[PDB]
Paper text:
Follicle-stimulating hormone receptor (FSHR), a G-protein coupled receptor, is an important drug target in the development of novel therapeutics for reproductive indications. The glycoprotein hormone receptors represent a subgroup of GPCRs, including receptors for three gonadotropins, follicle-stimulating hormone (FSH), luteinizing hormone, and chorionic gonadotropin, along with thyroid-stimulating hormone (TSH). The receptors possess a large N-terminal leucine-rich repeat-containing extracellular domain, which interacts with glycoprotein hormones (GPHs). The binding of GPHs to their respective receptors on target cells activates the Gs-cAMP-protein kinase A signaling pathway.
The atomic details of FSH bound to the entire extracellular domain of its receptor (FSHRED) has been reported. Surprisingly, the FSHRED formed a trimer, an unprecedented oligomer form for GPCRs, in the crystal structure. However, it was not clear from these data whether FSHR functions as a trimer in the native state. The trimer structure was crystallized from a PEG solution and determined in the P1 space group. To test whether trimer configuration depended on the particular crystallization condition, we crystallized and determined the complex structure in the P31 space group from a Jeffamine M-600 crystallization solution. The trimeric arrangements are almost identical in both structures, supporting the proposed FSHR constitutive trimer. The model is further supported by our crystallographic studies that reveal that the FSHR trimeric structural configuration is not dependent on the crystallization conditions and space groups (as in the cases of P1 and P31). The FSH residue Thrβ60, at the potential exosite of FSH, does not interact with its primary binding monomer but potentially interact with the neighboring monomer. Thrβ60 makes hydrophobic contacts with Val85 and Tyr110 of the neighboring FSHR. In our trimeric activation model, a constitutive FSHR trimer is only able to bind one fully glycosylated FSH molecule, in contrast to three deglycosylated FSH molecules binding to one FSHR trimer.
Residue numbers in the entry:
A (entry chain X): 18 to 282, 291 to 294, 334 to 338, 342 to 356
B (entry chain B): 1 to 109
C (entry chain A): 5 to 92
The structure:
Amino acid sequence: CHHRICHCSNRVFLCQESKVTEIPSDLPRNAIELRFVLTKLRVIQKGAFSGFGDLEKIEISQNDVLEVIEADVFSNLPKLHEIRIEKANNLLYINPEAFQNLPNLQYLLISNTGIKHLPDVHKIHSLQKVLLDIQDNINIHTIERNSFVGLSFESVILWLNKNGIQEIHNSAFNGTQLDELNLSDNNNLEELPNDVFHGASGPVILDISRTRIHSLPSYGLENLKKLRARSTYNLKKLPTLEKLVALMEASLTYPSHCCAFANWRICNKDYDLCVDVTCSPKPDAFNPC
Amino acid sequence: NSCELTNITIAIEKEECRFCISINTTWCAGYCYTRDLVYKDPARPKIQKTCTFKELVYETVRVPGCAHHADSLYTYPVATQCHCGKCDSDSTDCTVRGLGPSYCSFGEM
Amino acid sequence: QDCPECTLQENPLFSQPGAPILQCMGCCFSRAYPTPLRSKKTMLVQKNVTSESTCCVAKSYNRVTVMGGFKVENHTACHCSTCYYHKS
Ligand SMILES: *[C@@H]1O[C@H](CO)[C@@H](O)[C@H](O)[C@H]1NC(C)=O
Ligand SMILES: *[C@@H]1O[C@H](CO)[C@@H](O)[C@H](O)[C@H]1NC(C)=O
Ligand SMILES: *[C@@H]1O[C@H](CO)[C@@H](O)[C@H](O)[C@H]1NC(C)=O
Ligand SMILES: *[C@@H]1O[C@H](CO)[C@@H](O)[C@H](O)[C@H]1NC(C)=O
Ligand SMILES: *[C@@H]1O[C@H](CO)[C@@H](O)[C@H](O)[C@H]1NC(C)=O
């Protein structure tokens, strides 16, 4: 296979190097995979990847002159399950109309970009379980109300770790089925408001490791099974096992918290074929319990 | 399983002199066993290993100059131990494809 | 010592006689090397090491229900593709 500027092999198109300044008009509609690496793209044009009814994967990596993702860009793609927006140091803005109806989306990666805000996902409406993985985006400082509603009709995994988050609004997770939520390595994050988990299932897994979070909310943790709070020094007070009923594993900071989980606590049939809280740090060298 | 210390050739790019220098070093490459889970439970063990550095060291090499631009120093990491484990997102770029260890903006081998 | 390729195998837990459950499992190529400077120019957060990795995942499947009530996948095809759960 051969294209004017993009390298091609088995309906897979890799558009690499500085010679690539605009997304080619002559890209075959049958394309399965489309990659844009090391390009001198300044903007990804309004409705650029619309029409590729076969296209299942998109990659936008290592583009140092990309600044904006226009409206209607990720539209008319019934077969797309994966988008990867990686290493885009000058990408500051994403039009709240960029992510359109993507019914088979399974993975959205936004890593190491300069984006000032989270992506607008209310128009995705995927039929699939979605993994929204947003990491190393130091210019993202706030998760606003209803940030993930309409992303999926299915349960969702939300990796919002290693960004620059310091504010989380009430109901930020409303109208969402939260499977897993990772807020770790957002060091400036000082508090989890009480209505953070308002109108949201779960999460089953929560990671607040290496955060200045002082306390957990009174409700919303009724489904929490795994809590990861490594180097979460501002906590010190945890909810009672009457509130964390579902909790079965917990990797915390203070060994005093583990002592409280010990000494207190079937199904028809490595694998968990279905007993107490698997807590750490658990040292006996100093206790105190 | 078959993740081990392999010999590689890397490119050190002196942008100002419009060339790269080749340096044979030791890094990681090989195969790791993975399992795609059949039962998608939120508390399931969704964990995948990759072939990557277990421990590393930094090495400084003298990169030549040309004209109007003097010879500089460049520090690069070297694999010391490889393992099939988690990709350390803190230090590593955990991706599908990179530009290649011997990537140069001005040539090839 | 060797690493068998990513292919369909019978799931021990969910499989039953006459009705096995097929799962993608095996080995895929993954590597690591220092990040080229060209890449470092596009990274707002610097990463000195670069990991290129692929994982054993189902190319296609069919949602089924077994052992009274378990919504499990019966994998029909496998390939080494994108790793979603390999990072720390
Ligand atoms: C919560 O989400 C629903 C849609 O799922 C919406 O109708 C409602 O206004 C939202 N509530 C708040 C508090 O924003
Ligand atoms: C790597 O290269 C060095 C020097 O050429 C050699 O001693 C060594 O045997 C090679 N093999 C491995 C696996 O490191
Ligand atoms: C080291 O690099 C040279 C190129 O400079 C290459 O030809 C050779 O295979 C490498 N290994 C040894 C042991 O010289
Ligand atoms: C899984 O797929 C195999 C092959 O298509 C089939 O024989 C088997 O009946 C399926 N298992 C279930 C539980 O439907
Ligand atoms: C990363 O590499 C650069 C030089 O290439 C250096 O400034 C930095 O200290 C290295 N080490 C770490 C741990 O980032």
